């Protein structure tokens with residue numbers, strides 16, 4: 611069946627709006643918080659969606675991947691292909707992964723734009739020194755202590771987005787305020803009516 | 804957000820009905836035909852769904868897998884995890900893969916029933932001699948000729964389902980008739996109202 615027919619039966623608000631909102635950023639930058647609140651926002655506004663994150667991907671589909679650069683590349687590649695299917699199905703697919711390599715984020719975008727599906731890269735941008743100081747899950751302490759090897763920002767590279775569709779300054783917005791900025795982008799791009 | 808809230812915004816017909824319809828069977832048994840017509844049927848009845856098949860999975864997510872037993876196991880494992888996400892999102896996920904190994908089909912089921920998501924194994928059951936004689940894509944000729952190695956039914960095993968939820972005798976039903984049997988199962992299980 612065609613995408614337009616999907617858009618008729620997916621959700622109450624007519625129109626096909628499948629797409630992928632690709633969050634990227636350091637550990638503790640707020641990706642989980644923003645993605646969960648974005649999901650709540652969309653559902654409350656009648657827009658079916660689904661979130662892919664480390665919790666539901668790296669314990670399942672990607673349980674056989676570590677954090678070597680090669681495994682992060684394959685992690686993101688698989689996530690991009692799954693997000694493309696969710697977008698093709700008519701859902702707003704929100705992805706919440708560190709995704710530290712420019713090439714793999716751009717490969718994820720190419721998979722979508724080849725299939726003529728919208729792809730929005732959102733750089734969840736908090737300074738590393740802020741993420742370390744808050745250390746919301748204690749991970750940065752263990753990384754400095756050597757108990758987690760190759761942790762992004764400490765012993766593994768994060769390549770900052772140079773051309774995201776949106777930059778979220780999460781040391782300066784509360785959850786709902788950063789969500790409002792994502793909603794504005796989705797309205798501009800005719801995802802959210 | 805919860806599954807019940809998803810069921811409110813996914814589709815027009817209220818109620819959460821996410822699940823996976825897992826087709827299994829020999830090449831040429833009719834999996835593609837039945838899955839595509841099932842998708843058409845559900846969409847026409849206002850039920851959002853999505854089909855995973857060799858066309859959209861083995862050229863994308865699973866492009867790095869062959870047909871060794873080990874690669875078929877990983878192929879099915881990844882597909883099962885993706886189907887579980889689609890079911891969790893509230894969609895009827897139709898899968899259309901040979902899935903020749905009992906253990907991997909049962910592992911796929913366990914992934915779903917652990918997450919309390921319904922899983923319906925449909926054995927698309929045509930005799931191998933029938934599939935060979937029709938040879939709808941010419942594949943069986945190339946398998947006998949040695950141009951495709953380890954082709955299911957010729958140089959690779961198909962373990963017949965012993966406990967499917969439904970057996971589809973596709974040498975004896977036309978497309979719509981086999982679809983009607985799947986619809987009956989989904990009605991019995993409160994997926995289709």
Ligand SMILES: Nc1ncnc2c1ncn2[C@@H]1O[C@H](COP(=O)(O)OP(=O)(O)O)[C@@H](O)[C@H]1O
Nearest residue numbers: 638639640643644736744780781783784785788
């Ligand atoms: N001053 C603030 N008040 C409320 N929420 C905030 C504030 N600053 C950031 N956030 C939100 O908190 C999450 C993490 O922000 P961060 O500054 O990394 O940690 P923390 O919020 O614990 O200070 C992000 O989703 C962000 O949107």
Ligand SMILES: Nc1ncnc2c1ncn2[C@@H]1O[C@H](COP(=O)(O)OP(=O)(O)O)[C@@H](O)[C@H]1O
Nearest residue numbers: 831832833836837929937973974976977978981
């Ligand atoms: N007598 C029939 N008339 C119409 N469709 C059929 C008939 N027998 C099978 N089918 C459908 O054709 C597809 C493949 O059936 P199969 O017998 O393997 O090949 P073929 O249909 O070319 O004879 C299946 O989806 C099945 O539902």
Ligand SMILES: Nc1ncnc2c1ncn2[C@@H]1O[C@H](COP(=O)(O)OS(=O)(=O)O)[C@@H](O)[C@H]1O
Nearest residue numbers: 637664677682685707708709710759760761762
């Ligand atoms: N070495 C690590 N580097 C970054 N995150 C890690 C590492 N080890 C475990 N984690 C974590 O695994 C999740 C990050 O995974 P991803 O977002 O999937 O990373 S990515 O680089 O491959 O995109 C977080 O739960 C998290 O803190």
Ligand SMILES: Nc1ncnc2c1ncn2[C@@H]1O[C@H](COP(=O)(O)OS(=O)(=O)O)[C@@H](O)[C@H]1O
Nearest residue numbers: 830857870875878900901902903952953954955
């Ligand atoms: N050696 C093969 N055995 C079975 N199918 C093959 C083989 N090589 C290519 N194909 C095909 O690949 C698809 C079957 O793939 P799957 O359904 O994904 O198989 S499975 O065994 O791993 O579940 C069909 O398009 C098809 O005919």
